[PDB]
Design a protein around this ligand. Structure first.
Ligand SMILES: O=C(O)CCc1ccccc1
Length: 404
């Protein structure tokens, strides 16, 4: 039937839509402060709510993808996201923005984000991590797509920021319905392959949800996610506090987008080739080192760029390597439910991390506390990821007894 790279194209489209959604809020920071008396933090609340609901709704999305297939889930998410974003176009208050952009659009976003992550590796048992990376690279591409687009619409005279919400919400709804229309696992029996009585079987959602290793992974995910979201918003400020012009600090930090995107594909390919655990742990460790190293490298465009690139490499790699690791531990059959639950860690980190980093800075007036805490969290994650080896594969005695 369909060539098994179509799934990858689909995940690229859906994750790109999700990246556009999660990038928009910064676009609207200045227009909304011009129209209303709304603070940056008041709008950042809209973004944080979006992350909370998005990360939470992956879990119902994965359960529903597993139960009734990924197509229905992704297309419903396209509907919800289109509704919430477009209604943000028609807002007049803060709570309307929180509801439209934060809750509705984020709901649709999680339902778009997850099912492809669970479906693509099923078409690619020889390259599971690369398939997953194609399901997530769109979150690194969404900024590059929306930035110029949202600027173009806001600055045009007959238009405005509400026009960004309206037109971009139609565009994203279309891309997500197109993505979710063509998404389905391979057929129940024959597996697309040129190549390939004890009988094992994949884990069930209830079996994995009860494993201690699932929750060690959950803890590690929360730790790495939280560290990144706690400091990334501070990189450029660290630069300016070190003496750089705002322009120069901003240029340096912008390399984070390129590495954040590239790592998602490249790391998947690497671990497909050499295995997950050791490279994964090294990324967390290097992330620990970077949180420390900024106090020595962060005062020059070259150094700050190195830190931004590294931080982006390790941060972005988490969103391929955690689903790949979960796939290795429990298998693809219940990957929708298993990884949907696991991503709720990111939902919570997205809600709290940026706020907590800001509070630590403003409490102390310096960057030592947030970056030191991020380093500790990345050190814990290093420990967990390095020490956690796959659980035992499951015997399937119900299938096993079928042999005379
Ligand atoms: O980069 C990603 O793959 C998603 C990042 C994220 C974090 C928290 C909530 C939603 C999405």
């Amino acid at each position: 039937t369909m060539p098994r790279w179509v799934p990858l194209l689909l995940g690229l489209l859906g994750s790109t839509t999700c990246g556009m959604l999660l990038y928009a809020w910064s676009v609207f920071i200045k227009p909304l402060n011009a129209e209303f008396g709304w603070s940056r933090a008041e709008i950042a609340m809209a973004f944080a709510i979006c992350c909370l609901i998005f990360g939470l709704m992956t879990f119902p999305a994965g359960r529903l993808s597993d139960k009734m297939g990924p197509r229905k889930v992704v297309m419903t998410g396209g509907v919800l996201l289109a509704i919430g974003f477009i209604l943000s176009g028609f807002i007049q208050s803060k709570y309307q923005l929180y509801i439209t952009y934060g809750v509705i659009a984020g709901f649709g976003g999680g339902m778009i984000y997850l099912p492809p992550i669970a479906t693509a590796p099923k078409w690619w048992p020889d390259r599971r991590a690369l398939a997953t990376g194609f399901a997530v690279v769109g979150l690194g591409l969404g900024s590059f797509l929306m930035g110029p687009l949202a600027t173009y619409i806001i600055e045009k005279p007959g238009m405005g920021w509400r026009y960004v919400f309206w037109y971009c919400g139609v565009a994203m709804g279309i891309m997500a319905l197109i993505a979710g229309a063509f998404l389905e696992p391979p057929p129940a029996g024959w597996k697309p392959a040129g190549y390939t009585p004890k009988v094992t079987r994949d884990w069930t959602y209830e079996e994995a949800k009860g494993d201690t290793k699932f929750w060690l992974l959950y803890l590690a995910y929360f730790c790495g996610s939280f560290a990144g979201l706690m400091v990334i918003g501070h990189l450029a400020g660290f630069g300016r506090d070190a003496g750089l012009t705002a322009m120069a600090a901003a240029g340096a930090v912008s390399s984070l987008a390129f590495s954040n995107a590239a790592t998602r594909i490249l790391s998947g390919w690497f671990v497909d080739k050499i295995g997950i655990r050791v490279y994964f742990a090294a990324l967390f460790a290097l992330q620990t080192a970077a949180m420390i190293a900024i106090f020595q490298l962060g005062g020059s465009v070259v150094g700050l760029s190195i830190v931004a690139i590294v931080i982006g490499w390790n941060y972005g790699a988490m969103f391929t390597l955690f689903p790949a690791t979960c796939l290795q531990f429990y298998g693809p059959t219940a990957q929708g439910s298993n990884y949907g639950l696991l991503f709720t860690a990111c939902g919570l980190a997205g809600f709290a991390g940026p706020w907590v980093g800001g509070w630590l800075k403003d409490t102390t007036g310096t960057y030592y506390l947030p970056f030191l805490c991020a380093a500790a969290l990345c050190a814990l994650g290093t420990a967990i990821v390095f020490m956690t080896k796959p659980p035992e594969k499951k015997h399937a005695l119900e299938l096993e007894v079928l042999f005379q």
